Every structure is written in C-alpha cells, then in structure tokens.
Amino acid sequence: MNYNNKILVSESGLSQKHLIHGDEELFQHELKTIFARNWLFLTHDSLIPAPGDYVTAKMGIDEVIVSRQNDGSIRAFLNVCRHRGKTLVSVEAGNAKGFVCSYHGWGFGSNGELQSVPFEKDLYGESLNKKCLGLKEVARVESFHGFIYGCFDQEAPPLMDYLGDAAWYLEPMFKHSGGLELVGPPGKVVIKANWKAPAENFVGDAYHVGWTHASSLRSGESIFSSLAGNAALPPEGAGLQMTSKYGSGMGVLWDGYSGVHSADLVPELMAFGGAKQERLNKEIGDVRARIYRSHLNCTVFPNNSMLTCSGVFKVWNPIDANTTEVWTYAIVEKDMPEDLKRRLADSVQRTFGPAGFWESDDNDNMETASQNGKKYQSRDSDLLSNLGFGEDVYGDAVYPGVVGKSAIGETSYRGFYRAYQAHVSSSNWAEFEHASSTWHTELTKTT
Template sequence: MSLLIDVPRGLQSARIYHDRDVFDLEMERIFARTWLFLTHECMIPNKGDFITTRMGQDEVIVVRQQDGGIKAFLNVCRHRGARVCPVEAGNARGFVCNYHGWSYGTDGALQSMPFEKELYRGRLDKRTHGLREVAQVTSYHGFVYGNFDAQAPSLLDYLGEARFYLDIWMEANGGAELVGPPARSMVHCNWKAPSENFVGDAYHVGWTHAAALKAGGSMLAPMSGNAMLPPAGAGLQVATRYGHGLGILYDVNPGAHDTPLAQEILAWQAKKRPAMEKAYGALRTRYYGSHINGSVFPNNTYLWGSSLFKVWHPHAPDRTECFTWAIVEKDMPQDLKQRIANSLHRTFGVAGYWEADDNDNMESESQLSRGHMTRQGFMNAQMGIGGDREDPELPGVVGESAIGETSYRGYFRFYEETMRAKSWAEMPVQDSTWKRQLIEAGSGLDPDPAGEAMVPAQAAA
C-alpha cells in the first residue's frame, strides 16, 4: 500500500485504476464496510415497495417493511444462489426464486419451498435460511445508505463534518428528493476515476466541457475554453474525514444548463432565500445559491446546481455501472421537477452531452493504466498543496481557491487509511491527526525543473 498512495506528496499510483489485486482489496476494505448509497425514500414510499441495486459487486434488494422501516438483503437465494428478484423496482408481498421456487417475505424470511414436507422432511431450518441482510441501513433526510459492516460508525458519524454542507441541499431548503428511476449505463473505466473527478475537479470544466458549456447556453459559459479563471475568492474546496469532499463555486446555481429553465429555477430559489436566511444564516443560504460538486466516499456523487446525483458501481477494474438521477427540491411543482430531470438527462444522462465529454477522460485514464510502463508511474494531485487550512467558520480542511485538488488529497488520504486497515477498529485516526496530514502535505516538496523531486523515493528505487 505504501506505493499506491503518497499522502504527503499528493501522488497516487497508476495501479489503482487497473489492477485486479487492488480492485479485490477495495471490495473487501471499502465496499464491504463503508456506507454506500442505496436509494431515496421517495422511490419506495409504500409497504412492499422495493428497488434492486448493488453494493460493490453484490446485488441487493432494498425493500419497505410492513412497519414502515427499510431493510436491504443480498439478492441471492439461500438454496443454490440464483437471483431472487430479477427486476429493477416494484411492489411485492415477497420474492420467489426463479430456479426452484423458494419463497421469501419482504422481511427476508424464508417462507416456503416447493414440496417442503415431502422432500425436506423437516430437516432444513428455515429460520437460518432467510435472505442475508445488510447489517446497517439508515436514511439521512430521505437518502438511504447501507453498510455491510455492523462495526462501522453510524451513518451520521460517517458523514460527520460533511453534513454541514450536505444539509444545505438535503435539508435546509425544505428537503431534496430524486427523480427516478435512475438511468443506467456501463462505462469502461475504474470506479474511482469519476468519483474523484466529482469530489474535486473544477479544473477540467472550462477545457473538457468547452463545447458543452456553450451549446446549452449554460451560465458557466464564460469558462468555456479556459477563457477565464474564477477570480480569487470565487469559491473553495473542502475535505472532510472518511474521504468525503466537495468544491463550491459561489453564487452560481443555475439548476440546469439551459437558460430559460435556469432562470425559472433561480426565481424559485429567490423566493425561498429570505426564510432560509432566517433559519440557517447568510453563509449557508449563499451556498444554497451556489454550485457544489462533491462525492460521499466512496462512490456517490452530486452536483448541487446542476441537479445531478449519481452512484458509480464497480463491476470490474475497468467496468463501472453508473446510476443517474435528478436532484430536485421536494416542494417544487411536479412539472418543474420533471423538466429539471429532462434537462439533467440531456446533459449528464446516458447519452448526455456533458457525460460523453467526461466518459472519454474516465475511460482513457483507466484503460491506459493497463500499460506495463504506465502503471509504474504516479498521478498528480498537488494543485494547491501546502495551502490547505482549517477555517473558523467552515468544517473540514479548506483549500485556498475554487480550483485545486484539496478534496482529491482528502479522498485518497482516507482511501489509503481504509485500504491498510483490517477493521474499523484499526482506523482510530482523530480529527486533529488527519487534518494535520492534509495541512502539512507538501511541506517537504522541493520542486525542481526536471520534476524528479516530485517522485516518491520508493517509486524511484
């Protein structure tokens, strides 16, 4: 692991994008024990409502219980392991396996098997053959996350300081929800490539999306072709414990990248701002009207201000399934919600004209890392290194400008921590420790014209 992530220097080995051993360890150390987004409560409002999704490479069913709670189970029959629920969503009294017909309740209990008396003769204990349950399932402002690890910290603790920023759009404006069902697509990239991009890459927007910025009449169009750099003080980046991170571009929240719709959303927000300001203060109300890009570690991405919400499901080192929803405010008129979703799918949906720009980069960095020589190298996330700090008003570690790689460094600092540890008990890192690691990063760097000093000693050996 010491060669994969160099926290003090802000470097990451190219192996993390295309190495089967690294991928397998990620499934064990990240996807089997961190909190993973499952669904929004609005997708399963009634008893028996369910959706199917993934947690790492495992398929799961998420289902509303008779008591109104939510549980999640492996979508795998306890007989011979066939898929129990073959559809993406619906309402059911239970699930019947397609192979031999074992039948389970929505609570996961094994209810009956064909010819139970005649063939099993009371020798199979049904109580121990229910669907395997996800250890922890918690809803945060309606956003439902699951965790396979019963020892993991609670979702509230896991989100930690990130909640200060998430609450601005998840709660403070009256709450947010998703418009589904999610669009699904397969991208030939490693799952981290897009997840790290959304955690902190404002750098690529003006360049990668140069044409897209103009095509839709986006409010961000002046950035097209890197014609301008957001001025000093135009935004910031934040890293919080457990790898979450975000970037804020102040006072730019078009809600959609097409002008008439954006104007309508801005007018909607303007009406809500006075009440928000009273309840949540001027700073967080400003963030409500700002563009926020971010990822909840490991694979859940959002763009508040572009109405985007995604999950990156790993299938293989270079295959990632993307689920895409639109984020809308709960109290918006239904018609407005639908038009925002339509706009979101034109930009960041399966064939969206922003999405295609991004996927080209995600796929090239992942596929090229397969090369024997390429994978000996390191990728660079040093922008702004040495300028990260704590802020009296803002939770987390804060970077020095709107464009930088502070949240990349925070993301990979935790990635390194969790990949090393055999259990949550081995991750006792305190706030002061991880913050110091980020703030002091870069202090030993002595850039030279040949760039040699930027290469970790181990890698050069």
C-alpha cells in the same frame, strides 16, 4: 502486492500510483476494504414510499433487494437465494409482500425470512430450520434526509458521523430546503473506466470544467458559459473546496443555483432558489442559506457523486478495474412545482445522462486515464494532486473540514486518496481509525 506496506498514495495525498486505476488484484482487494466496509448508496424514500415497495441496487459487485417494511423501516438483502444461489429478483423495482425463487420455488418475505418451501412437509418434514435460512441481510441501513445508504460492516460509523464535515455543506439543500426527492428511474450506462476516475472527478475537479467542457459550456449557454475554453478564470472567492476524515469531499461554487442547466431553465431556477434563500436567511443564517443555493460538486466516499442545484446524482458501480456501470438520477426539491420538477429531471439527463452532452465530454478523460493504469511504463508512475497544497486550513471559524479557500484546486482529491489509502492498508474499522488519527494534520502540512 503487500497492501500493508505498499505506498499507493504518497503522504498528504499528494500523488497516487497510476496502477490504482488498472490493477485487478487491487480491485479485488477494494471489494473487501472499500466496498464491504463503507457506506454505499441504495435508494431514496421517494422510490420506495409504501409498504412492500422494493428496488434492486448494487453494493460494490453484489446485488441487493431494498424493501420497505410494514413498520416503515427499510431492510436490504443479498439478491441471492439461500438454497442453490440463484438470483432471486430479476426486475429493478416493484411492490410485493415477498419474493419466490424461480428455481425450486422457495418463498421469502419482504423481511427476508424464509416463509415457504414447496412440499416442505412431505420433503423436509420438520428438518428444515427456516429460521436460519433467511436472505443474507445488509448489516446497516441508514437514512440521510431520505437518502438510504447501506453498509455490510456492522462496525462502521453511523452514516451521519461518516459524512463528517461534509454533512454541514449538504444540510441546507438536503434538510433546510424542505427536502429532496430522487426522480427515477436512473439512466444506466457502462463506461470503460475505473470507478475512482469519475469519483475523483466529481469530488474535486473544477480545474477541468473550462477545458473539458468548453464545447458544452459554449453550446448550452448555462450560468458557467464564460469558462468555455479557459477564456476566463472565476473571480477571487468564487468558491472553495473541502474534504473530510472519511474521504467525502466537495467543491462549492457560490450562487450557481442553475448549474449546468441551459438558458431555458436559468431564470426560473435563479428565481426559485433566490426566493428560498431569502426565507432561509432567518432560519439558518446568511452563509448557510447561501450554501443552499450554491453549486456543490460532491463525492460521498467511495462511489456516490452529485451536483446539487444542477440536480445530478450518480452511482459509479464497480465491475472490474477498467469497467464501471454509471447510474444517473435527478434530484429535485420536493416543493418545486411539478412542471419544473419534470423539466429539471429531463435537463439532468440531457446534460449528464446516457446521452448527456456534458457527460460525453468526460468519457475519453476517464477511460484513457483508467486504461493507461494497466500499461507497463505507467503502472509505477505518479498521478499528481498537489494543486493548492500548503494553503488548506482545518477548523475554520465559518467553513468546517479541511478547506481550500479557492474555487479550483485539488484539496478534495487529497482527502479522498488519504482515506482510500488508510482503508486499503487496514484490516478493519479500528485500524482505519488508528491510521486516521492525524488526518487533518497530514492534509494541511506546509500550511
């Protein structure tokens, strides 16, 4: 397939070829143009707070070691020995000053440097240039209020710029609430879906909630329980959708601070968020203080998703075109009482974890949609994302980004796929930028 010319995503993001969820050649191409190019979630400060603390993470199909340096910074390295290519670290987290390879015993520092080689003097003499044999380093590592992302591409925009208009929506919770912590370890489960299926679902899919999750809504008794079975459409102005230049996007459901949490946690959460909102009104203004305690379903392009308030934090780790490894963490506000944080963390896993009754509702949707992308008669068919098209705005006085002023639509799908197509057809960041010079105009056509 010629990725320069092939129209995988139609103008304005209105449709996508179904093959994008099944094609293995395209998957290989995404490793290059999506995952080796863009910012990917690694970990949180709260998981590696002290010098020497480390975790392993995936970046696309690569595995990296993410380590807290002596000077407080974080560096990340390919988890691959520089000698004969063995995986260096076989655990998920720990604390160490270095990593010794179990094959021939080369010892690398927490800083990635080749520090020691067994019998170096007797074997290599002064011949080994250890200075050139440090672990392959992730070019860029940046923090968004404690959340650490990495990028293999030195030419990438800074993480803050990359978040674009989405950053404004995240800041109330990520910054102004006093800060978040990630509660680990994550649940990890393999699903038979393309990474883009859950990514698109979290970026912009409010439409499915009432029908897909009818049973969970009815059973769990959460603040959204009236949606069950499409018995009721949310009020006018119940929320909105947004998207951004680099593909990140989210839904906003006004005031839904208890999110998917079952009746047992609703009163406590609604009290906590409401009390913080009252304090935030004076600091960041009414609208943004209200955003803090509104439920955001967001995807940070390409494969990191979250539900604020519900506290669900996801990484959709790609394996092949119909395989994804799902990592599920809980996010909690640092100043919540510890007992509430524990219960909130359990409730996130209860609903969206490996045995998450909500997450299980989505399994068949994602898996069959992805697998149908391989089927001959479906490859060239068009997945539709036209809901709300011609009603989106850009440059609104209050809400930034390309914005659909309705709770349910496909605004965020269109922006996600616009960015996806611009990347897959581009060779580098300069070409993506050229391809994206009229991004918001493309998204608001017929408006």
